[PDB]
Amino acid sequence: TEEFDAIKIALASPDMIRSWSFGEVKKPETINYRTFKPERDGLFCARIFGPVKDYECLCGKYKRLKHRGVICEKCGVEVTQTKVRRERMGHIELASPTAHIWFLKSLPSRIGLLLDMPLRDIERVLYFESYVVIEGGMTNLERQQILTEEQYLDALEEFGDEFDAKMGAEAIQALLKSMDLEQECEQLREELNETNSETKRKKLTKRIKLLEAFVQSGNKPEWMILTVLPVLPPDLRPLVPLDGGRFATSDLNDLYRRVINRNNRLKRLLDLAAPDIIVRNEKRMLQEAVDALLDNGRRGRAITGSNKRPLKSLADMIKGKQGRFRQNLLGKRVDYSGR
Amino acid sequence: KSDDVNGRTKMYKNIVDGNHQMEPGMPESFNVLLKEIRSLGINIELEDE
Amino acid sequence: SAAVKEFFGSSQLSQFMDQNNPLSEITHKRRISALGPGGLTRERAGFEV
Amino acid sequence: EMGTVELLTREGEIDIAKRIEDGINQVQCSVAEYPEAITYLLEQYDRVEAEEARLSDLITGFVDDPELAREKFAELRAQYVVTRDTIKATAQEEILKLSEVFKQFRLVPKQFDYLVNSMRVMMDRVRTQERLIMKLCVEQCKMPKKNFITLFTGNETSDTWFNAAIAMNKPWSEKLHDVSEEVHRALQKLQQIEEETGLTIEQVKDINRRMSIGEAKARRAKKEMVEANLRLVISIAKKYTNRGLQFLDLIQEGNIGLMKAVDKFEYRRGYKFSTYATWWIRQAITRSIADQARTIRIPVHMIETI
DNA sequence: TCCTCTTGTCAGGCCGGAATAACTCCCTATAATGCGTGACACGGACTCTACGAG
DNA sequence: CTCGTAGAGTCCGTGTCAAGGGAGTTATTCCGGCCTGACAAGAGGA
Numbered sequence: 001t002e003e004f005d006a007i008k009i010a011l012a013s014p015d016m017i018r019s020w021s022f023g024e025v026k027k028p029e030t031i032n033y034r035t036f037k038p039e040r041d042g043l044f045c046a047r048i049f050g051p052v053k054d055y056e057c058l059c060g061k062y063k064r065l066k067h068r069g070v071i072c073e074k075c076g077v078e079v080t081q082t083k084v085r086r087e088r089m090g091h092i093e094l095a096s097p098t099a100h101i102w103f104l105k106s107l108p109s110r111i112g113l114l115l116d117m118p119l120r121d122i123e124r125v126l127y128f129e130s131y132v133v134i135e136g137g138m139t140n141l142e143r144q145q146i147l148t149e150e151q152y153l154d155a156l157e158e159f160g161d162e163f164d165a166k167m168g169a170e171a172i173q174a175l176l177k178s179m180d181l182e183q184e185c186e187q188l189r190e191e192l193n194e195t196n197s198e199t200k201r202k203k204l205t206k207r208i209k210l211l212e213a214f215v216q217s218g219n220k221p222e223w224m225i226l227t228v229l230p231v232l233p234p235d236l237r238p239l240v241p242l243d244g245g246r247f248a249t250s251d252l253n254d255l256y257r258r259v260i261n262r263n264n265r266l267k268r269l270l271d272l273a274a275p276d277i278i279v280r281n282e283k284r285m286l287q288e289a290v291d292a293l294l295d296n297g298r299r300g301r302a303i304t305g306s307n308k309r310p311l312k313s314l315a316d317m318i319k320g321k322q323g324r325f326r327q328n329l330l331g332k333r334v335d336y337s338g339r
Numbered sequence: 340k341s342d343d344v345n346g347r348t349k350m351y352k353n354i355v356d357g358n359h360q361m362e363p364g365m366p367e368s369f370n371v372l373l374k375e376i377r378s379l380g381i382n383i384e385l386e387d388e
Numbered sequence: 389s390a391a392v393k394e395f396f397g398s399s400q401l402s403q404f405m406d407q408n409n410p411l412s413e414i415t416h417k418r419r420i421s422a423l424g425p426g427g428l429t430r431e432r433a434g435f436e437v
Numbered sequence: 438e439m440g441t442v443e444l445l446t447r448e449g450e451i452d453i454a455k456r457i458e459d460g461i462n463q464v465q466c467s468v469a470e471y472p473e474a475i476t477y478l479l480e481q482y483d484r485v486e487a488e489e490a491r492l493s494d495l496i497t498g499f500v501d502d503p504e505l506a507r508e509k510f511a512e513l514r515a516q517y518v519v520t521r522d523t524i525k526a527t528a529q530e531e532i533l534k535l536s537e538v539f540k541q542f543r544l545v546p547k548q549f550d551y552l553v554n555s556m557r558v559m560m561d562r563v564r565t566q567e568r569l570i571m572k573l574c575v576e577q578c579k580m581p582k583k584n585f586i587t588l589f590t591g592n593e594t595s596d597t598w599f600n601a602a603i604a605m606n607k608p609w610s611e612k613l614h615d616v617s618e619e620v621h622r623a624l625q626k627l628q629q630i631e632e633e634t635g636l637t638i639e640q641v642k643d644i645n646r647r648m649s650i651g652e653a654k655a656r657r658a659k660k661e662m663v664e665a666n667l668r669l670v671i672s673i674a675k676k677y678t679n680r681g682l683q684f685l686d687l688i689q690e691g692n693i694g695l696m697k698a699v700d701k702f703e704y705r706r707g708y709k710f711s712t713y714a715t716w717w718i719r720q721a722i723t724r725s726i727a728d729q730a731r732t733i734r735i736p737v738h739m740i741e742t743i
Numbered sequence: 744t745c746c747t748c749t750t751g752t753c754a755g756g757c758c759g760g761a762a763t764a765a766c767t768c769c770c771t772a773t774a775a776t777g778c779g780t781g782a783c784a785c786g787g788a789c790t791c792t793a794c795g796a797g
Numbered sequence: 798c799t800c801g802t803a804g805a806g807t808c809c810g811t812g813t814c815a816a817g818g819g820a821g822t823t824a825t826t827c828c829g830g831c832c833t834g835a836c837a838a839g840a841g842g843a
């Protein structure tokens with residue numbers, strides 16, 4: 001056991017997300033329904049997360065404790081303690097960069113204020129109602145100017161080249177990567193030396209503080225948009241067998257299933273060169289799935305299968321009353337107690 | 340008493356042996372918390388100095 | 389049959405008779421509840437009802 | 438989004454079907470027009486005859502029995518070899534006649550895809566080599582881009598632009614010797630690439646532009662049709678909404694099925710599209726509801742038995 | 744007299760064919776076309792009042 | 798000398814608490830038999 005202190009929090013970079021994860025979860029399958037062993041490489045996977053039963057591989061070639069670092073050649077499961085299946089994380093390759101809800105919809109929209117663009121505008125961008133000019137060259141249009149459908153059409157038709165604009169969360173990420181923190185910070189401090197209006201000054205200070213902290217911490221803005229999505233270890237969203245044949249699963253299994261399905265379908269639709277409208281719908285649905293996954297409660301309320309109650313997303317699982325369910329009230333049942 | 344697996348088993352053995360020591364470890368709920376927050380795009384690591 | 393048995397079984401107003409005293413039975417059968425579907429909630433309630 | 442596109446009435450649908458037919462036929466003729474594809478045809482037909490391949494791996498029905506195919510491919514080999522010997526005007530007319538006789542054949546889609554892809558990758562190699570050679574030239578020799586266009590364009594095979602650029606005696610023209618080896622070796626390599634093409638170095642341009650035109654035409658026609666029939670897809674979707682799958686997922690699977698149907702639809706049979714497409718849209722919707730519904734996925738036959 | 748060394752024959756783990764399952768390629772041809780409390784505090788938008796600049 | 802803008806104020810709204818038919822191919826369990834270790838009883842030597 002380490003002797004630690006100072007717990008550090010920062011945005012996870014995509015290479016770190018790949019770093020923690022041991023394998024990619026490509027197919028939504030969970031278990032074989034005949035023999036309830038986990039399917040590879042599904043949401044429950046022994047070769048990725050861990051061996052089901054202590055010190056025994058899936059296919060059953062290696063069963064002795066003497067084998068502990070060998071990795072079964074047929075089934076790519078390493079022979080180790082089943083408890084490891086509680087900590088190993090997975091990851092999913094998302095085809096279309098999707099926005100992180102927490103950094104968008106929270107009353108102060110930090111993407112918005114970093115981009116000094118109101119929330120409604122960004123909403124219009126992600127849902128594919130209008131484009132945004134990402135470096136619109138030597139033209140009569142600014143760098144954060146929105147163009148409507150047929151304004152983008154008249155511009156493209158007239159301006160074929162020297163004009164870079166896009167739609168959706170990938171557009172947002174692209175334009176976000178390009179912003180020069182240092183120069184904009186210098187501009188804002190020059191405003192502070194020259195600008196004298198109470199509320200404008202106040203807002204300016206706010207923006208300045210955000211930029212300063214962001215550039216000091218070492219977080220790069222483009223990470224606010226997620227490319228790789230980590231998947232929680234299986235044991236924390238278990239699929240335990242109830243007695244009598246019936247099964248119980250946490251909702252996260254369903255949410256992950258939905259995300260993987262829509263991601264795979266988008267992959268296929270892209271490979272087929274499908275019409276734009278349908279790919280756009282696909283990106284909308286994927287955004288929806290992700291937003292249910294990260295923080296359920298900021299949208300159209302995706303109910304679960306046949307249960308009427310909204311399914312509980314990660315954010316709900318963390319925040320409770322009060323907050324930490326088992327760490328905070330209430331409250332860690334204890335042994336050696338009577339009443 | 341509740342969430343530390345190794346601690347609870349070691350303390351069972353200690354009590355049976357007639358010794359009274361302790362070995363707290365990390366509460367399992369906190370480990371779950373780390374994994375659950377890490378499931379988001381939030382990096383939470385235990386630093387060292 | 390699904391809707392009828394759902395109402396009778398899995399409903400707020402369909403509850404286990406408390407059958408330990410004749411008084412308990414008779415009083416439970418002659419009861420008037422303001423809860424349930426189409427009715428007030430405890431948090432909703434108010435203090436004037 | 439669906440509401441914007443109005444209903445592509447019947448005669449419009451037959452119109453776009455003719456445009457699709459024209460694009461597909463154009464691209465099929467275009468394939469016919471380079472002498473390295475019949476190499477692979479005859480080679481795998483013999484594979485089929487020597488029994489190293491399959492009778493269904495090469496053709497999907499002729500146009501105007503094993504006897505007929507075997508004889509037509511024997512005479513195909515004969516004509517091919519004789520026009521290859523007689524390559525040295527006459528070769529262009531004989532290639533046109535070989536292509537016109539080969540038009541008779543219809544290959545099953547994967548092999549036609551493979552042939553269009555082999556011709557695509559050879560043209561890709563051509564364009565990539567020319568682009569890298571011109572990059573090295575313009576950037577290391579500071580080659581003005583107007584003389585680049587005029588002189589370099591047209592041959593891509595002869596040394597006329599090479600020896601004219603070095604002949605202009607310009608000081609960057611003298612540095613041109615610094616990378617003369619790379620540039621002229623790439624010119625020779627390209628000449629060999631077209632020696633394996635064999636026709637020339639301009640018909641590569643003609644073929645890629647004609648193929649792009651056909652493909653774009655076909656894609657646009659199918660886009661129009663699909664956007665017109667989105668309403669049909671959503672209409673059929675209403676049945677399956679409450680099988681634990683989401684509404685929009687259903688509509689998407691239906692869209693994929695409708696795409697397939699459009700790709701396989703034949704108007705010439707004379708029947709209305711909607712009835713025919715219904716089959717594929719329902720097939721896709723049913724298969725997806727069966728597959729993505731349950732948590733512990735269950736094979737489709739077992740679902741049918743349930 | 745006690746402990747050690749020896750002759751001899753069976754059994755269990757492992758692999759092969761078979762037979763019931765699964766997954767993709769055939770799926771098709773009349774027409775069907777949009778349908779699913781409540782108090783608090785803070786922030787944003789709109790209005791009013793007053794000042795400075797052209 | 799006159800007009801528009803800047804600043805201040807108020808009201809409202811939000812988050813947060815209190816239709817299946819099938820042909821071909823491969824996987825997987827299941828019974829039948831081969832191939833190498835291990836077990837029994839006695840004998841001989843210290």
Ligand SMILES: C[C@H](CCC(=O)NCCC[N+](C)(C)C[C@H](O)CS(=O)(=O)O)[C@H]1CC[C@H]2[C@@H]3[C@H](O)C[C@@H]4C[C@H](O)CC[C@]4(C)[C@H]3C[C@H](O)[C@]12C
Binds near residue numbers: 244245403404
């Ligand atoms: C969905 C259902 C919820 C029932 C519920 O919530 N009842 C609440 C009943 C409340 N009342 C009526 C008893 C009143 C209150 O308790 C007291 S008061 O009125 O509120 O004061 C769950 C909870 C227990 C689950 C069963 C068990 O696993 C055993 C068995 C396992 C098999 O593999 C599958 C079948 C079985 C029968 C399961 C079925 C089903 O999966 C059950 C009933």
Ligand SMILES: [Zn+2]
Binds near residue numbers: 057058061073075
């Ligand atoms: Zn194994």
